Amino acid sequence: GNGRFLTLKPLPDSIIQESLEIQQGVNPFFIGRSEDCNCKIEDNRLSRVHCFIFKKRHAVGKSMYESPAQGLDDIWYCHTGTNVSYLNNNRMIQGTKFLLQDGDEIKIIWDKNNKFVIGFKVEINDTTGLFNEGLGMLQEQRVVLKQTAEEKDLVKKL
């Protein structure tokens, strides 16, 4: 790749028919209305920085007998929007993180009454030493985590 690792493509199912590509070189990748975000998505419903994706070095506790990935990288999806995003089947509350498995469909905004439906398809084109690329790290099948100063710090300098 020339600098692209993950591809988030606002599919036709969403009001947006565009394709976004997270330049592996940029970490973390910010998405939202304001062009300031590495990704450009303007939806009056979401905030200037509705959400951002961050890549981190994947590492387990121990390797007794079995030898896991040892120490590779995994892409994380962070959400900071008020409308809360939805990843596949997990809820994303303002200040949450989620693993992005190859072919991860993330819902940025969904309105039942407003019929406002959004969603991006994550397609890993390049694997920057990815432990795998994003299969769900076994056992833990798609679980939502909380964000900390580390994540908030990245957006703070947005």
Partner 1 sequence: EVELTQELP
Q: What is the binding site for partner 1 (CB under 8 A)?
A: 44-47, 81-83, 109, 111, 114, 116
The C-alpha atoms of residue 17 and residue 28 are separated, in whole angstroms, by 23
Residue 33 vs 97, nearer CB to partner 1: 33
Residue 7 vs 94, nearer CB to partner 1: 94
Residue 42 vs 153, nearer CB to partner 1: 42
Find the shortest distance in angstroms from Cβ 39 to partner 1. 17
The C-alpha atoms of residue 128 and residue 131 are separated, in whole angstroms, by 9
Find the shortest distance in angstroms from Cβ 72 to partner 1. 36
Residue 63 vs 82, nearer CB to partner 1: 82
The C-alpha atoms of residue 93 and residue 149 are separated, in whole angstroms, by 16
Find the shortest distance in angstroms from Cβ 42 to partner 1. 10
Specify whether the CB–CB gap between 43 and 10 falls below 8 A: no
How many Cβ atoms are within 10 Å of 38's Cβ, its own excluded?
A: 19
φ, ψ dihedrals at 19, nearest 5°: -130, 125
- Residue in 68, 92, 74 with CA at minimum distance from that of residue 82: 92
